[PDB]
Scaffold this active site. Structure first.
Site, PDB file in Angstrom:
ATOM      1  N   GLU A 256      44.243  46.344  61.046  1.00 17.40           N
ATOM      2  CA  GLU A 256      43.109  45.755  61.743  1.00 17.40           C
ATOM      3  C   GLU A 256      43.524  45.483  63.185  1.00 17.40           C
ATOM      4  OE1 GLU A 256      40.846  46.403  59.436  1.00 17.40           O
ATOM      5  OE2 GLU A 256      40.115  44.398  58.921  1.00 17.40           O
TER       6      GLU A 256
ATOM      7  N   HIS B 174      24.968  29.816  28.983  1.00 20.06           N
ATOM      8  CA  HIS B 174      26.018  29.933  29.985  1.00 20.06           C
ATOM      9  C   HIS B 174      26.213  31.400  30.361  1.00 20.06           C
ATOM     10  CE1 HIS B 174      28.246  30.629  26.199  1.00 20.06           C
ATOM     11  NE2 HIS B 174      29.078  31.342  26.937  1.00 20.06           N
ATOM     12  N   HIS B 175      26.652  31.624  31.603  1.00 18.15           N
ATOM     13  CA  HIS B 175      26.775  32.946  32.218  1.00 18.15           C
ATOM     14  C   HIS B 175      25.427  33.624  32.465  1.00 18.15           C
ATOM     15  CE1 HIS B 175      30.723  31.951  31.090  1.00 18.15           C
ATOM     16  NE2 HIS B 175      30.984  32.876  30.184  1.00 18.15           N
TER      17      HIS B 175
ATOM     18  N   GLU C  50      39.195  39.702  36.075  1.00 17.32           N
ATOM     19  CA  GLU C  50      38.400  40.890  35.765  1.00 17.32           C
ATOM     20  C   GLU C  50      38.447  41.934  36.872  1.00 17.32           C
ATOM     21  OE1 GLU C  50      37.421  37.827  35.417  1.00 17.32           O
ATOM     22  OE2 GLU C  50      36.583  37.518  33.410  1.00 17.32           O
TER      23      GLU C  50
ATOM     24  N   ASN D  84      54.689  42.891  57.548  1.00 15.26           N
ATOM     25  CA  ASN D  84      54.589  42.791  58.999  1.00 15.26           C
ATOM     26  C   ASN D  84      53.783  41.563  59.406  1.00 15.26           C
ATOM     27  OD1 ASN D  84      52.049  43.739  58.189  1.00 15.26           O
ATOM     28  ND2 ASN D  84      52.500  45.838  58.844  1.00 15.26           N
TER      29      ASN D  84
ATOM     30  N   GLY E  38      50.761  39.949  58.463  1.00 15.35           N
ATOM     31  CA  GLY E  38      49.347  39.946  58.768  1.00 15.35           C
ATOM     32  C   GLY E  38      48.707  41.286  58.462  1.00 15.35           C
TER      33      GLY E  38
ATOM     34  N   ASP F 225      33.581  34.189  25.119  1.00 14.92           N
ATOM     35  CA  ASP F 225      32.983  33.940  23.810  1.00 14.92           C
ATOM     36  C   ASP F 225      32.022  35.059  23.395  1.00 14.92           C
ATOM     37  OD1 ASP F 225      30.929  32.956  25.688  1.00 14.92           O
ATOM     38  OD2 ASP F 225      30.019  31.978  23.952  1.00 14.92           O
TER      39      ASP F 225
ATOM     40  N   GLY G  50      38.529  52.294  49.566  1.00 16.44           N
ATOM     41  CA  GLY G  50      39.360  51.557  50.507  1.00 16.44           C
ATOM     42  C   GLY G  50      39.441  50.060  50.292  1.00 16.44           C
TER      43      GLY G  50
ATOM     44  N   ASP H 229      51.583  43.359  52.901  1.00 20.32           N
ATOM     45  CA  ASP H 229      51.601  41.947  52.535  1.00 20.32           C
ATOM     46  C   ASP H 229      50.183  41.408  52.380  1.00 20.32           C
ATOM     47  OD1 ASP H 229      51.396  42.517  55.251  1.00 20.32           O
ATOM     48  OD2 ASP H 229      52.196  40.575  55.874  1.00 20.32           O
TER      49      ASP H 229
HETATM   50  C1  LIG Z   1      38.421  33.056  29.407  1.00 19.56           C
HETATM   51  C2  LIG Z   1      37.557  31.802  29.228  1.00 19.56           C
HETATM   52  C3  LIG Z   1      38.184  30.579  29.066  1.00 19.56           C
HETATM   53  C4  LIG Z   1      39.674  30.295  29.040  1.00 19.56           C
HETATM   54  C5  LIG Z   1      40.017  28.900  29.549  1.00 19.56           C
HETATM   55  O1  LIG Z   1      41.413  28.813  29.595  1.00 19.56           O
HETATM   56  P1  LIG Z   1      42.059  27.471  30.287  1.00 19.56           P
HETATM   57  O2  LIG Z   1      41.815  27.487  31.781  1.00 19.56           O
HETATM   58  O3  LIG Z   1      43.540  27.397  29.996  1.00 19.56           O
HETATM   59  O4  LIG Z   1      41.263  26.186  29.644  1.00 19.56           O
HETATM   60  P2  LIG Z   1      41.702  25.454  28.239  1.00 19.56           P
HETATM   61  O5  LIG Z   1      42.894  26.144  27.618  1.00 19.56           O
HETATM   62  O6  LIG Z   1      42.008  24.024  28.599  1.00 19.56           O
HETATM   63  O7  LIG Z   1      40.580  25.458  27.246  1.00 19.56           O
HETATM   64  S1  LIG Z   1      36.910  29.445  28.893  1.00 19.56           S
HETATM   65  C6  LIG Z   1      35.635  30.594  29.039  1.00 19.56           C
HETATM   66  C7  LIG Z   1      34.353  30.200  28.965  1.00 19.56           C
HETATM   67  O8  LIG Z   1      33.243  31.055  29.076  1.00 19.56           O
HETATM   68  C8  LIG Z   1      34.094  28.708  28.766  1.00 19.56           C
HETATM   69  C9  LIG Z   1      33.016  28.409  27.722  1.00 19.56           C
HETATM   70  C10 LIG Z   1      33.255  28.683  26.384  1.00 19.56           C
HETATM   71  C11 LIG Z   1      32.284  28.409  25.433  1.00 19.56           C
HETATM   72  C12 LIG Z   1      31.071  27.859  25.820  1.00 19.56           C
HETATM   73  C13 LIG Z   1      30.831  27.584  27.159  1.00 19.56           C
HETATM   74  C14 LIG Z   1      31.804  27.859  28.111  1.00 19.56           C
HETATM   75  N1  LIG Z   1      36.224  31.795  29.215  1.00 19.56           N
HETATM   76  C15 LIG Z   1      35.489  33.046  29.379  1.00 19.56           C
HETATM   77  C16 LIG Z   1      35.489  33.485  30.850  1.00 19.56           C
HETATM   78  C17 LIG Z   1      36.104  34.664  31.233  1.00 19.56           C
HETATM   79  N2  LIG Z   1      36.096  35.025  32.501  1.00 19.56           N
HETATM   80  C18 LIG Z   1      35.505  34.275  33.418  1.00 19.56           C
HETATM   81  C19 LIG Z   1      35.512  34.717  34.876  1.00 19.56           C
HETATM   82  N3  LIG Z   1      34.906  33.145  33.101  1.00 19.56           N
HETATM   83  C20 LIG Z   1      34.880  32.738  31.853  1.00 19.56           C
HETATM   84  N4  LIG Z   1      34.202  31.501  31.548  1.00 19.56           N
HETATM   85  C1  LIG Z   2      41.474  43.469  55.498  1.00 21.31           C
HETATM   86  C2  LIG Z   2      41.690  44.977  55.621  1.00 21.31           C
HETATM   87  C3  LIG Z   2      42.956  45.443  55.896  1.00 21.31           C
HETATM   88  C4  LIG Z   2      44.218  44.627  56.101  1.00 21.31           C
HETATM   89  C5  LIG Z   2      45.446  45.330  55.531  1.00 21.31           C
HETATM   90  O1  LIG Z   2      46.495  44.412  55.589  1.00 21.31           O
HETATM   91  P1  LIG Z   2      47.943  44.881  54.965  1.00 21.31           P
HETATM   92  O2  LIG Z   2      47.827  44.982  53.461  1.00 21.31           O
HETATM   93  O3  LIG Z   2      48.973  43.850  55.352  1.00 21.31           O
HETATM   94  O4  LIG Z   2      48.314  46.375  55.538  1.00 21.31           O
HETATM   95  P2  LIG Z   2      49.041  46.702  56.983  1.00 21.31           P
HETATM   96  O5  LIG Z   2      48.123  47.519  57.856  1.00 21.31           O
HETATM   97  O6  LIG Z   2      49.386  45.423  57.710  1.00 21.31           O
HETATM   98  O7  LIG Z   2      50.283  47.511  56.688  1.00 21.31           O
HETATM   99  S1  LIG Z   2      42.786  47.147  55.949  1.00 21.31           S
HETATM  100  C6  LIG Z   2      41.099  47.178  55.624  1.00 21.31           C
HETATM  101  C7  LIG Z   2      40.435  48.342  55.568  1.00 21.31           C
HETATM  102  O8  LIG Z   2      39.063  48.449  55.291  1.00 21.31           O
HETATM  103  C8  LIG Z   2      41.255  49.619  55.782  1.00 21.31           C
HETATM  104  C9  LIG Z   2      40.613  50.742  56.603  1.00 21.31           C
HETATM  105  C10 LIG Z   2      39.937  50.466  57.783  1.00 21.31           C
HETATM  106  C11 LIG Z   2      39.374  51.501  58.516  1.00 21.31           C
HETATM  107  C12 LIG Z   2      39.490  52.814  58.079  1.00 21.31           C
HETATM  108  C13 LIG Z   2      40.173  53.091  56.905  1.00 21.31           C
HETATM  109  C14 LIG Z   2      40.736  52.056  56.171  1.00 21.31           C
HETATM  110  N1  LIG Z   2      40.730  45.888  55.475  1.00 21.31           N
HETATM  111  C15 LIG Z   2      39.371  45.447  55.181  1.00 21.31           C
HETATM  112  C16 LIG Z   2      39.207  45.099  53.690  1.00 21.31           C
HETATM  113  C17 LIG Z   2      38.817  43.826  53.309  1.00 21.31           C
HETATM  114  N2  LIG Z   2      38.665  43.522  52.031  1.00 21.31           N
HETATM  115  C18 LIG Z   2      38.887  44.425  51.089  1.00 21.31           C
HETATM  116  C19 LIG Z   2      38.709  44.055  49.618  1.00 21.31           C
HETATM  117  N3  LIG Z   2      39.259  45.650  51.397  1.00 21.31           N
HETATM  118  C20 LIG Z   2      39.421  46.009  52.657  1.00 21.31           C
HETATM  119  N4  LIG Z   2      39.824  47.364  52.923  1.00 21.31           N
HETATM  120 MG   LIG Z   3      50.455  43.541  56.919  1.00 20.45          MG
END
Ligand SMILES: CC1=C(CCOP(=O)(O)OP(=O)(O)O)S/C(=C(/O)Cc2ccccc2)N1Cc1cnc(C)nc1N
Ligand SMILES: CC1=C(CCOP(=O)(O)OP(=O)(O)O)S/C(=C(/O)Cc2ccccc2)N1Cc1cnc(C)nc1N
Ligand SMILES: [Mg+2]
Ligand SMILES: [Mg+2]
Lengths: 539, 535
Positions: free
Chosen positions: B455, B113-114, B50, B449, B451, B27, B395, B422
């Site tokens: 890691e 809100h927010h 987002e 693979n 998992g 909004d 990363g 995966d």
């Molecule tokens: C995108 C959105 C809604 C779609 C619902 O879509 P949906 O799930 O399909 O519901 P509905 O179609 O049944 O209405 S609501 C909404 C609100 O800020 C709710 C609100 C509006 C006015 C006054 C107070 C609160 N936002 C904004 C919003 C964006 N990104 C995140 C992480 N969070 C949010 N909140």
């Molecule tokens: C969970 C993870 C990996 C699983 C991949 O699983 P997957 O997708 O299945 O790949 P694979 O190895 O099985 O082929 S890697 C990894 C790294 O920090 C990679 C890294 C480590 C040391 C040095 C260099 C790089 N993390 C941690 C991690 C967690 N949360 C977020 C948002 N981000 C990350 N990065």
């Molecule tokens: Mg994997």
């Protein structure tokens, strides 16, 4: 495996009420994770991403009173920041543990993965400061008392804390505590409590009719039973707002419906706004809770109780624990409030907002955990008449869509034997959909109702109803469990008629498998509460 | 609809090279979004959340040189902060626009809100400060010059910026500028440039063999063609590291492979580390790029060029734009131009990357996530005109799938190849629904693979925290679309993979190929990254 700082943190987690740790692994926290896995008291819950993990911890803490989240340095913690912010905003005690590079590596300013490439390792700790009540960087020299300080502060304020745990620090020797960590109950100075008591009594002694309005801070500080017993021992008009819904058995005498400012039902407006004195207990009059600040409650009309201070009329009394303020007011109401409140006063065809909530009304039962997301879900669920022992989880102050689906995974983890009902819009569920895979992996059996009206219709009611930005990708909801699982223990239905919804609900009443019900609703249909809040602004 | 601040922001945005705006409505930004929709020059791209939107904007900027993200106050902006952080770490110019409550509501400290429920509206603006090079809270009194300041700084530093746009401010009157927003190229002081030039020339003049190592900062500052022509005009051993891979046509004479420290192939180590002089152009020797800091390059061996300063040996020369430093070194190399560069069944990591090697073509956009994907794709020998997008400094797994949505949005006519594990794809899966909604035709290869197997190689291979929920990957498009029109395969043999790649070569539909690989299988660089660290 000698007892170390990692074990001390885990022992303190269990002291605080957490039996689970949610998060996502990374090389900076793997060795800490070994202690979580080996621990007999803490169960690791791996989630599909860090934002969902923080949402799930939030829902868990709203069920158990405390929760903990584990992420890796940089990429993990910053992914969870919206979750911790929502926990801060709505006073939910979630501990954010961040596994970090070893101290020596940090001291050398190495160009390590998950940094900004500048040799700086405290950017992210500082960015978490506004959304935590306490935080610490753990060192060999401070570990155990900084752990206790942060958790104790979270217990007092019922808000998130943050701990950065460098990998080397987690291994340093520590000693198992003999006593559990407990927050000693604070006591106001007796003269200070006396001042609030006398002012409160003087006001209540002259009140012809007194009403009670309790909300979410009651839930957070463990005071739900105090307020239920309050209205049972002292019958009077009472209500909550949306955030604190579920404090009261809403079938009990004196309850007429949820208060939402000018959007309230007529009986609620008379019961609350019509009273000469309204006791506001743990209340925060947000825009959504008050239909755009259209509540009619004046300072002289009200007494309000906050965590550390209470107000009578225009006078604030600071340094008073909310528990003692409530105990004082219960005694005074027992003295002066002598009322017998007036008692409070099948659907077929195409599904509408009206007959949907009417159908769901007949389905809910004591023991239910009901979670609703922002949009038509939460603002229609406000009209549900909750029976006893319902945990009603809604996030209207922070208001992050997608919270609900992931929080339901956390709530079901906390309460495996309770029936969990998820009310999410089609748009909201897209933001956190991957968690559903966590539910299926873990054999959870929630009842997920996706209110499918093909787009963002809350927004449509607010502005640009035909604008393309309120459209979404149209998903095949009943096929998602079979995509996020090799063998889902789930059953899915698509319903468009009120009677089909009634039959389906009836069938899944005992929740032997995960249920996903795609609820077909009209695009422009909005519940009554929304119709007054969409009108609430623009002047 | 008089021209207003919302329109001025959009006009400036397109000046900087962004033709799309990614984000999620709310909004507080809906009224601004009306101007985005009505504008013929900027196209709104709604994303499934987002974080994915910020990832997609990042990938978009790696294709077009600039991107923009729109979120709502609090819940939207904080959901995207890991994306902006990664853009800062890897020098990607993404503009974060945050639609905010009106200024009057903010000044009254309303319980909106927010918010955190404390009446404060600058918490999140302040939390974005460490991960942006410039930021502003837009007011009626500063709007247009703060917009120009922040965007200009982003162009200079090639890094994210942040603008809070209160709803009332967006609606304030403004005037269309007659000139586009432009950053005038900086010029070093001539005495400062001479000092660098002299030092660089004297060092290069005594070099028997000189090698060239360029990396990602070359890409960010638009110097890719300058580096290619450099090595075409002055043949010599050259390479990139993982981050900057794709700067060079890797079939050219003088290229022997990607440099990764002690993990490098023998010919790469000799070509780069064996030269008495190594020109390091836009390089950052991170732990992943150097096999745990096992690169062997001394200060006296190297001349290094950074965005605002260059080094010869032990001496730094500050205040020299990297463009001028490169032009100087190109001319000096031309003055010392000497030596000429001299010359199954079951799927494994080894035969997978060999099969993929024969499949890639000029024009491909290839994205790989952290894990076996990125550490196997390093061994690919890229042809000309390849955009190779990898994020080894920040990363963040999940980046790749959502960034592929942004990259395909930037370049609808180029073939996009997504290499994701995966585990990584689970974090951002919903963005696949956006590609399907927008009729994109990427080739998505999911390395299954079962998992987190990188890691497993680091620590606790049998620990259940390295396991994930097992998804039915070939069934996901039909779940995230009512009419996906997608082509899905599950392959376990090298020859099936070769056959499938032939069928999707012209990418007439979105393709998802689930590649069944062994759980313990590790590509060569990964085995060397987790043997420098295990100490
Ligand atoms: C995108 C959105 C809604 C779609 C619902 O879509 P949906 O799930 O399909 O519901 P509905 O179609 O049944 O209405 S609501 C909404 C609100 O800020 C709710 C609100 C509006 C006015 C006054 C107070 C609160 N936002 C904004 C919003 C964006 N990104 C995140 C992480 N969070 C949010 N909140
Ligand atoms: C969970 C993870 C990996 C699983 C991949 O699983 P997957 O997708 O299945 O790949 P694979 O190895 O099985 O082929 S890697 C990894 C790294 O920090 C990679 C890294 C480590 C040391 C040095 C260099 C790089 N993390 C941690 C991690 C967690 N949360 C977020 C948002 N981000 C990350 N990065
Ligand atoms: Mg994997
Ligand atoms: Mg909807």
């Amino acid at each position: 495996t000698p007892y170390c700082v990692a074990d001390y943190l885990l022992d303190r987690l269990t002291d605080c009420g957490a039996d689970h740790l949610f998060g996502v692994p990374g090389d900076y926290n793997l060795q800490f994770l070994d202690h979580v896995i080996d621990s007999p008291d803490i169960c690791w819950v791996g989630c599909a991403n860090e934002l969902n993990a923080s949402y799930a911890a939030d829902g868990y803490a709203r069920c158990k009173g405390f929760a903990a989240l584990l992420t890796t340095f940089g990429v993990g913690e910053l992914s969870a920041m919206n979750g911790i912010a929502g926990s801060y905003a709505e006073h939910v005690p979630v501990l954010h543990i961040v596994g970090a590079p070893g101290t020596a590596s940090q001291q050398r300013g190495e160009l390590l993965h998950h940094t900004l490439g500048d040799g700086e390792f405290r950017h992210f700790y500082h960015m978490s400061e506004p959304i935590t009540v306490a935080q610490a960087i753990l060192t060999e020299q401070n570990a155990c008392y900084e752990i206790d300080r942060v958790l104790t502060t979270m217990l007092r304020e019922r808000r998130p804390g943050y701990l950065m745990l460098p990998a080397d620090v987690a291994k340093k020797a520590a000693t198992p505590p003999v006593n559990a960590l407990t927050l000693r109950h604070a006591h106001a100075d007796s003269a200070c409590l006396k001042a609030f008591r006398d002012a409160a009594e003087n006001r209540l002694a002259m009140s012809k009719r007194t009403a009670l309005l309790a909300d979410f801070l009651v839930l957070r500080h463990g005071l739900k039973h105090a307020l239920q017993k309050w209205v049972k021992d002292v019958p009077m008009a009472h209500a909550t707002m949306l955030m604190g819904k579920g404090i009261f058995d809403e079938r009990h005498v004196g309850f007429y419906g949820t208060y939402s400012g000018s959007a309230s039902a007529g009986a609620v407006k008379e019961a609350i706004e019509g009273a000469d004195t309204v006791l506001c207990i743990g209340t925060r009059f947000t825009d959504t809770l008050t239909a755009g600040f259209t509540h009619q409650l004046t300072p002289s009309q009200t007494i309000e109780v906050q965590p550390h201070a209470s107000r009578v009329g225009d006078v604030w009394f600071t340094g008073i624990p909310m528990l003692q303020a409530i105990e004082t007011l219960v005694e005074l109401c027992k003295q002066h409030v002598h009322d017998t409140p007036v008692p409070s006063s099948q659907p077929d065809g195409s599904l509408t907002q009206d007959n949907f909530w009417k159908t769901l009304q007949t389905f809910i039962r004591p023991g239910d955990i009901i979670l609703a997301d922002q949009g038509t879900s939460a603002f229609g669920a406000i009209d549900l008449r909750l029976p006893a022992d319902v945990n009603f989880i809604v996030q209207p102050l922070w208001g992050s869509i997608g919270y609900t689906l992931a929080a339901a995974f956390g709530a079901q983890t906390a309460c495996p034997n309770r029936r969990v009902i998820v009310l999410t819009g089609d748009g909201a569920a897209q933001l956190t959909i991957q968690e559903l895979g966590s539910m299926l992996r873990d054999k959870q059996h929630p009842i997920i109702l996706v209110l499918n009206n093909e787009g963002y219709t809350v927004e449509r009611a607010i502005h640009g109803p035909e604008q393309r930005y309120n459209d979404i990708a149209l998903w095949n909801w009943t096929q998602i469990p079979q995509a996020l699982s090799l063998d889902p223990q789930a059953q899915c239905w698509r319903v468009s008629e009120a009677e089909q919804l009634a039959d389906v609900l009836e069938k899944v009443a005992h929740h032997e498998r995960l249920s996903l019900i795609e609820v077909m609703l009209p695009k422009a249909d909005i519940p009554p509460l929304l119709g007054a809040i969409t009108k609430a602004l623009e002047a």
